[PDB]
Amino acid sequence: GDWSFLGNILEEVNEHSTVIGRVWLTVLFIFRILILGTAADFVWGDEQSDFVCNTQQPGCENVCYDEAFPISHIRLWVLQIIFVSTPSLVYVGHAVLLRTYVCHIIFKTLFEVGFIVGHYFLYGFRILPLYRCSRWPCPNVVDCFVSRPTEKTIFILFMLSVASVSLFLNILEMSHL
Amino acid sequence: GDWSFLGNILEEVNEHSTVIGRVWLTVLFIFRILILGTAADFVWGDEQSDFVCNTQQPGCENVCYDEAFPISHIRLWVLQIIFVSTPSLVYVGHAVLLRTYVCHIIFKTLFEVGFIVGHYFLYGFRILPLYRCSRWPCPNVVDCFVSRPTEKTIFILFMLSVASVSLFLNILEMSHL
Amino acid sequence: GDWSFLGNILEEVNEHSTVIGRVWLTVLFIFRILILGTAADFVWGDEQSDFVCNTQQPGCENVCYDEAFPISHIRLWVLQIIFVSTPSLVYVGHAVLLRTYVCHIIFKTLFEVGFIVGHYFLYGFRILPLYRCSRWPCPNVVDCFVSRPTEKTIFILFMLSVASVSLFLNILEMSHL
Amino acid sequence: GDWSFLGNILEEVNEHSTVIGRVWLTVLFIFRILILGTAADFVWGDEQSDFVCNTQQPGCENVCYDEAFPISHIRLWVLQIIFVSTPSLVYVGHAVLLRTYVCHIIFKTLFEVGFIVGHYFLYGFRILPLYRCSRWPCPNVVDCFVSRPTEKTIFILFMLSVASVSLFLNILEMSHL
Amino acid sequence: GDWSFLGNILEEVNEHSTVIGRVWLTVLFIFRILILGTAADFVWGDEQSDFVCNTQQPGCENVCYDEAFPISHIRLWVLQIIFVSTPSLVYVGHAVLLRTYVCHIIFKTLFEVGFIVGHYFLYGFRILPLYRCSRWPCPNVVDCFVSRPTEKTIFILFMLSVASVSLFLNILEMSHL
Amino acid sequence: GDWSFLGNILEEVNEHSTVIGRVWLTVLFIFRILILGTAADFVWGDEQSDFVCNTQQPGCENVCYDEAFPISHIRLWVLQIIFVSTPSLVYVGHAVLLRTYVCHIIFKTLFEVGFIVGHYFLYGFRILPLYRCSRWPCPNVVDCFVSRPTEKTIFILFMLSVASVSLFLNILEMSHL
Amino acid sequence: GDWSFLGNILEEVNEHSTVIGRVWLTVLFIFRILILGTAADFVWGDEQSDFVCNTQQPGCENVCYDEAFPISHIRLWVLQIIFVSTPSLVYVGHAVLLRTYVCHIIFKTLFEVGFIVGHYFLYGFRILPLYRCSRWPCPNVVDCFVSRPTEKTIFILFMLSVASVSLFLNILEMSHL
Amino acid sequence: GDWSFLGNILEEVNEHSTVIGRVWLTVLFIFRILILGTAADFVWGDEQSDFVCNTQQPGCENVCYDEAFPISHIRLWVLQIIFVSTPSLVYVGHAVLLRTYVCHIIFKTLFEVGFIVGHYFLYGFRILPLYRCSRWPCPNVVDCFVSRPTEKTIFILFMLSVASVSLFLNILEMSHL
Amino acid sequence: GDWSFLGNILEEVNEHSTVIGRVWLTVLFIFRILILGTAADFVWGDEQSDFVCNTQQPGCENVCYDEAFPISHIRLWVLQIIFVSTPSLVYVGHAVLLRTYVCHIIFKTLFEVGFIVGHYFLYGFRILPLYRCSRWPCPNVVDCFVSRPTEKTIFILFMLSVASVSLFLNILEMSHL
Amino acid sequence: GDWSFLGNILEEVNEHSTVIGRVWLTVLFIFRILILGTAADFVWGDEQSDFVCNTQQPGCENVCYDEAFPISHIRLWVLQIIFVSTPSLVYVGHAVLLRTYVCHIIFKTLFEVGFIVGHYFLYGFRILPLYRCSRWPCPNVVDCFVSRPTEKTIFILFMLSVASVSLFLNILEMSHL
Amino acid sequence: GDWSFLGNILEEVNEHSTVIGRVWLTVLFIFRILILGTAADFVWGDEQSDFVCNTQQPGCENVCYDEAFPISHIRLWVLQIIFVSTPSLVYVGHAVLLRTYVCHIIFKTLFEVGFIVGHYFLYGFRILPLYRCSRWPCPNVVDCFVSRPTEKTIFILFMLSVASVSLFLNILEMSHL
């Protein structure tokens, strides 16, 4: 994706970040961005094309998809990566002080916590192959099916553990400093 | 997208911009461009492919789509990002004075206001899954359906709040300076 | 698109161009190229896929498309951007004198005028959703339909106004110098 | 396309090439490569998808396509651009003498002549929308249809005139030097 | 893929890595990444589109695919390349000592062993064209078919031998140092 | 149809019927029965098969047919022929007196009047090719089409005039006797 | 139908039947048989062909039909006409005494009562256009639709009133004799 | 068809008809009825099923059929056979005098003349395979096709010559008597 | 069906048959023939048309039907009615003695017993809607479905009870005489 | 078919016909009528339904059928049976003299000769499975296929031999008498 | 079928036939005609409709059917019943002598033998569900499938045994007389 400029700015930040902070930044780039672009994008690229429902109603398919997946997991992770990354960028902008660092890491922690709990609220880290829905065009609660469920929950769990690791790094850095 | 050259020129501008102006430029790149290219493009990429209407008339589908979405939200945001960004480029061109800065920020403010109000006029920040249309080939006001409505209104609201934030930054910078 | 090398050469030209000429070059890159690649390409990318005609004849669709759109608007704009840009490149090649500058700007003006009038001749800046055609495989003047007509005429008008602005810049620079 | 490395090497050649030779190199990059990648690729990208023939035989379509277009025009132009460009690369390799220059330009001239005459032999610079073919699976000389014929012959003619211009440049440079 | 930044960091590591370690890093980039992106991606890009099963049930296809391929081989290799590469990045981060080197190479060895044995557990390096499955929507153990089985097992075997070579390099480096 | 037994009984009645009554009985057999069986049956035999509506909803077609034609015209005429014929059969049963004859002819007159006015109430002797309906599965008042409308209204008018002739015969016989 | 022989035997019975009994026999032949063969047969002849359900499951349609209509109304009326008619045939067989007549008419009465109440039990004289069913292949209680519902309930009501009339005739004959 | 009773009555008439009148009655039964039922019915039985039009509009087919064939030729001949036959039946009814015979034959002559001229008015004894129609749902005068045109015009001509023969017989009988 | 001649011969037999034998003959005609022709024929007339199986294999449907129903129940009943009826015809042929009567009734009894037990062997008086079959073209024991199962088992049971009644009549006549 | 009345009249003729003439009449009824109705009708009943041509043009099928079979063989035989039979009917009409008999048999002979030679002219007693046709909607002489060719030529040959036998009988009767 | 007249003539023959000959005539009517019309006709009525072959070639189906079944078994039995019955009709014609009887029975015997052996030659009393054919449009010996194979071979065997019984009757009558 169009990640060159952000990568440039964050690589500039890597000079001023703490050693643990460098580890966190590398966790971000190596895992969240690389996996999201390289692997996840191809997984979810056929999220709606292969979402075949049972009824031959015309509109039930995309409506029931929308209900099942209000926002796609990739989108939520793009927003999450950006939101969690942004405090670091704000801090370098100030640098280009310690209280600012504490505030920015706390923001990262709180936003990433908000994202893992919101994601759990929408889907509890376990896509199921089946979704029975009852939107208006869909008659009598038709059962619709999902594409690559297992692989999608694998990446969900993976990225959730990555976010938990980022939280561990941030709070341990906090208590440390 | 083909954003390398623009990014280069605006990064050159970042030297001369005010600190708040740097914050605004970063808001632009980090959120509007990155989200528009990375996330929104994949969302709207199946905007017409999955716009299934109910009638089996041949031409009703694309006509009713066109009526529903005269111009796609992504396109409007590409034009908006470019138009709002352009005054900054004009200012650096002059630099490569204070009155010029005031004029350019006022232009940014007014254009971005024009875009949020025009966008609201076309669609009031809430895509609905259903659109009943009555174009000529479409007989007897057939009801047609939209793809990923919820996710699209989420990005609409998101980018609308981002534009409101850009307006806050610009007017606070104005009153400040 | 494969615009890096051209951008490099024209950015080299930006050193020797006049201040108004720099404004023109920026108008070119910021609007014509960026919009053509970023926005227009996705618009016209489903120009033939979604061009559904009414008859169930096998060959009427693509023939009637070809008659309706002899050359796609994007193609004409790629050729126009290249042709209008080329005199500047010729001038830098000479630089790497005033009469040469006058000749090159006149060429730009005349070619861009030729393109706006040719484009108007083919389509008068207003795509209509309907096109009745009478090619040989198409029997009895079947009515065929177009994809995203409104959005396409919006970009047509937009780029036409951009070309008119480029003409204003070039002739005002001429009278100026 | 993957033209960065070639562009680098030829840009290195541009230092040692004659002024007319620089004009030729720019003609190459600005027109043949940029148009082939930016415009032609999207034109021919639906060359077989939209090649609908009349019979409901299973295999007639792709066979008759293959007969009609033994090799695609884009492919022939990729090979032509590479073959005609290669002598210049050979010359810089020697540089990194006058007789070598004469031999290389003669090679360019002869190869480009060979390509325009071969292309004319296969198709005489005028794609027609119809192609009646009589391959084995196709029964009783079915008439098949082509996608975007007019636009394709426009680019054919365009690139043919570009090749004629390259021949003019090369032979005038020859007689000159 | 989005491998530029990782490549930059690992190329920086290549200065501090041992000569055998440089050989290992080159094995990684030249074979695993280049093949995974350049060749494998196009192979598996039609993994579900062309996975045609026999029944005309609506949902059996994607469910049975998911059972057959819980996670795609490409995804597992992206995760494997990243996981095995990460210890090197951790080591350079420390550098930017010998015990650290030993720990990192042991981690690489153990993770890559874990990946080859896990991959064997899921699929024993031999995709078969047929997969009979008995998920709920699939009635009476329908036999479903796979796309490009032979080519996929060829790349599986290839990359498995590459991983075995990486293990040889790592353990020989270990015993050596 | 299974009209042999009824014909036998009515032919037995023809001995006792009045001369005008014989004319009426012959009008019945020659026109109403013969046309209903021989001609009308083949007309209405494709009444629902060829009732193609516009929407691709599954159930709209037969529902909208049912609304349009609650009972088929043939059925109503079978019931009408039987009901109007029955008084004659009752009279022969009594024969096998004058007051009975008067009562039976009055019954015939009143029932046939009831049938022509009821038929007019349902459809006013003019089937139109189009019927817009708004039943529940049919969305947004889809327009559905009818098979052989003109021929059906021709037979409707024909049989209506035949019933009017039967009324003329019955009342003139009444006033006569 | 194959009603000639039965009609012959019952016509032979008409000599020995009571005058009211002749009226009943004529009610039978004129209405139940003639309508069942002439009119009803064409109505129910497309009972399953046009029974379109909503789901695209393969087997839901005919299963749900079977549940909705365990036995077709025509079949039940063929069995009813035969069963109610049979006592008369038994009586003529004895003739070819008064107690026998009483027993046979009582049998007719009781069987016809049994048929009207059984028919009401299966369907309460009112076919509805919709039938939601939940058989095994039908998933999530799909709603299926019926052909010519209104006309079918009209004939149901008609024949039910005819059976009530036959009961009136039989019991009044009983009390009379 | 249900021609037994009519045949019985006309066979009864054959006793009282003149010798030439017997020849006419036999012409009627042997040719018009036998051919209409035995041969023509199977010809026109697929008149609408195989009436395939070119457009993929839903309703154009049956509408354009209706316009092309307002009433089917068989129907017109059933009505014609009945109308022309009826005067004979009226005459036997009177018999069961010479002036009556003259009036009835004149009626036969005039009605049959009316039918041949009306039939010519609708279709001039020459069905063509093609019928371009322009009803409302049919867009842009689509060309529709007819089933068994040649065979249908053969029977049309045949029966027209038979009617001309009946006219010859009737008028020669007239002048004779 | 073509039952007139057989009915004639058996009606001739009815003169010589015993009173109980007349009752049996009437049971035959009134129930087995009339129901088989009038009702059952329409039931089984869509036995294969609506036998939809689940797989999209081409040949599985009719093969699995054939396995499920080796011979249709109607056919078996036509053969049974003929075989059981034939001894009576043989006896009249002899008449046109008592030992012959005993032999013929015993034959009727034994054949009808053979038919009820054979029918039970093939299908145990209970058609189920589902039939899983494993013929060669059918892959992996696909489950296929049957049309009107309930109604078919109702007629099966009905006719089985009728055959049991015929056996009761025959053996009671035997013991009687 | 509706052959009862004709059969009655010809059976009446059988009294007055010569012994050889009775043999001819029986040849007619036993073979031509019985086979035409009983066997041929079911053969040709799917003459157009199963006439599948190769092109996916809409109208080529029925047009090419019409060209291939201008009039169906059954129709020609119905007309032939009627025309050849009619002279006998004319003769009985005269009877109800010897010169009349000679004239009628000569007419039979000449008409039947005309029919066998006309039939040969249209099709030379050998239907082939393939018919390449070049009507207007059919493009480039598509090859179309016929249903049950072998069986149809078997009946053609059969009936041709029957007509030759009728000619033998008629001319031998002539020379005899 | 149209068997009334033949039945009349053969019933007239039954007076003059020998007692064993009456048994043979009854075997004919009761079994061959009744089964052929009543049962077999419905079996073979879907002989080509449900003959689904595997290839998606357009013409392979009906061609391969024709090869598999040159003439349908029903047709062969109609011809056989007529041919074997005809000698009896010839004999009554003579009656209306003993040597004639012997000649006619010998003809019956020889023709029926010819038919059973010809039928065996075409198909050896065992329809198989599969028929691999290699006609021209059918490519690479595709395997096609047959409808109701088992039931068809059951009737084949049945009627073959009936013909063997007719042969037994005829030759035993011969030796007897």
Curated annotation (Swiss-Prot), chains A, B, C, D, E, F, G, H, I, J, K:
<feature type="transmembrane region" description="Helical">
    <location>
        <begin position="105"/>
        <end position="125"/>
    </location>
</feature>
<comment type="function">
    <text>Structural component of eye lens gap junctions. Gap junctions are dodecameric channels that connect the cytoplasm of adjoining cells. They are formed by the docking of two hexameric hemichannels, one from each cell membrane. Small molecules and ions diffuse from one cell to a neighboring cell via the central pore.</text>
</comment>
<feature type="topological domain" description="Cytoplasmic">
    <location>
        <begin position="12"/>
        <end position="20"/>
    </location>
</feature>
<comment type="subunit">
    <text>A hemichannel or connexon is composed of a hexamer of connexins. A functional gap junction is formed by the apposition of two hemichannels. Forms heteromeric channels with GJA3.</text>
</comment>
<feature type="intramembrane region">
    <location>
        <begin position="1"/>
        <end position="11"/>
    </location>
</feature>
<feature type="topological domain" description="Extracellular">
    <location>
        <begin position="42"/>
        <end position="70"/>
    </location>
</feature>
<feature type="disulfide bond">
    <location>
        <begin position="53"/>
        <end position="144"/>
    </location>
</feature>
<comment type="similarity">
    <text>Belongs to the connexin family. Alpha-type (group II) subfamily.</text>
</comment>
<feature type="disulfide bond">
    <location>
        <begin position="64"/>
        <end position="133"/>
    </location>
</feature>
<feature type="transmembrane region" description="Helical">
    <location>
        <begin position="154"/>
        <end position="174"/>
    </location>
</feature>
<feature type="topological domain" description="Extracellular">
    <location>
        <begin position="126"/>
        <end position="153"/>
    </location>
</feature>
<feature type="disulfide bond">
    <location>
        <begin position="60"/>
        <end position="138"/>
    </location>
</feature>
<protein>
    <recommendedName>
        <fullName>Gap junction alpha-8 protein</fullName>
    </recommendedName>
</protein>
<feature type="transmembrane region" description="Helical">
    <location>
        <begin position="71"/>
        <end position="91"/>
    </location>
</feature>
<feature type="transmembrane region" description="Helical">
    <location>
        <begin position="21"/>
        <end position="41"/>
    </location>
</feature>
